[PDB]
A paper describes a structure:
Substituting His/Phe with Ser/Ile should expand the substrate-binding pocket to accommodate the bulkier substrate [name], and the strategy termed “double mutation (DM)” has proven to be useful to enhance [name] hydrolytic activity of several IsPETase-like enzymes. Here, we report our experience in establishing the P. pastoris strain that expresses a [name] hydrolytic enzyme from [name] termed [name]-DM that was identified from sequence mining from GenBank and modified by the DM strategy. In contrast to the protein expressed in Escherichia coli, [name]-DM expressed in P. pastoris is inactive in [name] degradation. Structural analysis indicates that a putative N-glycosylation site N181 could restrain the conformational change of a substrate-binding Trp and hamper the enzyme action.
The TPA-binding W180 adopts the C-type conformation in the [name]-DM structure and an alternative type in [name]-DM-S155A. This suggests that DM strategy has conferred the TPA-binding Trp in [name]-DM a wobble conformation. In both structures, a sugar that is covalently linked to N220 was observed. N181 and N261 face towards the bulk solvent and could be glycosylated, despite no additional electron density map attached to these residues was observed. Notably, N181 is located adjacent to the TPA-binding residue W180, and its glycosylation, if any, could likely impose spatial hindrance to prevent W180 from wobbling and impact the substrate binding. In all three structures, the TPA-binding W180 adopts conformations that should collide with the MHET.
Author numbering: 23 to 292
Write the structure that this text describes.
């Protein structure tokens, strides 16, 4: 099927386990130069063309410096990625959802500014969210409230009641940390997964024998979580069905049946 959003080589496991084939630059977004979020860190490919836009939120008392992995790893596979700082360290999930929307609106603005390093670099119609803990809840609430979004990746989601997510229509991949002692997977992440309609493309992958920061910088799951996140963004932000096997096929089965993973659920195939 013709796909104008397809970029980069045919994917193989080893390639998706490391920084991608797009050379990237990063720049700081000053809190003072934006409204509706606390600024953050911008990653973009230096090669020409338009790329999907992704906004990533930290959790409670979290800063963008703790998620630079996701900025670099996603951008280097061919996305424009803004890891936000929030207005306050203490912003709740609903607030983080509004800030993720403003962050994506910010990218759409900068796309039309001749001065911006991402001038003419953003496909403003192809937007996704992701986040850690209350940022994960926030990404899923932003997906609920903005059903034009292409993908959400909540990671170790925290407080928000599962009942909030019974109408989510955005393709959602959730990461769990099996021994999360802040947001226990069986009471926080898995009920959220289960609440999403079975008509929505979804996936849950849980990291074995690890706690709440297993998805964050220094978490020690770059190869697996990076591969799954790149693959989910590629599949849904870019409509790139070459990535299906990494979320539903042979390469997914090898990962979820490995010693690194304690659970997976999905409504594959897709
Ligand atoms: C949910 O969707 C999946 C994939 O389409 C399907 O295989 C499965 O049987 C569905 N579950 C229920 C309860 O219908």
């Amino acid at each position: 099927e013709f796909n104008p959003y397809q970029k980069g080589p045919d994917p193989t496991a080893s390639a998706l386990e490391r920084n991608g084939p797009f050379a990237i630059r990063s720049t700081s977004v000053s809190r003072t130069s934006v409204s509706g979020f606390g600024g953050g860190r911008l990653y973009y490919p230096t090669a020409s063309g338009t790329y999907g836009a992704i906004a990533v939120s930290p959790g409670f008392t979290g800063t963008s410096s703790t998620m630079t992995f996701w900025g670099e790893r996603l951008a280097s596979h061919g996305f424009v990625v803004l890891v936000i700082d929030t207005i306050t360290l203490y912003d709740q999930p609903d607030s983080r959802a509004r800030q993720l929307k403003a962050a994506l609106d910010y990218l759409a603005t900068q796309n039309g500014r001749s001065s911006s390093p991402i001038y003419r670099k953003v496909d403003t119609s192809r937007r996704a969210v992701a986040g850690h803990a209350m940022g994960g809840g926030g990404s899923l609430l932003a997906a609920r409230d903005n059903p034009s979004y292409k993908a959400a990746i909540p990671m170790a989601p925290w407080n928000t009641s599962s009942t909030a997510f019974r109408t989510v229509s955005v393709p959602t991949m959730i990461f769990g940390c099996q021994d999360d002692s802040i947001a226990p997977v069986f009471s926080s992440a898995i009920p959220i997964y289960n609440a999403i309609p079975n008509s929505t493309r979804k996936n849950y992958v849980e990291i074995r024998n690890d706690d709440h920061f297993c998805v964050m910088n220094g978490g020690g799951h770059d190869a697996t979580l990076g591969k799954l996140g790149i693959s989910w963004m590629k599949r849904f932000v870019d409509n790139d069905t070459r990535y299906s096997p990494f979320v539903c096929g042979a390469e997914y089965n090898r990962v979820v049946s490995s010693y690194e993973v304690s659970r997976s659920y999905n409504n594959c195939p897709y």
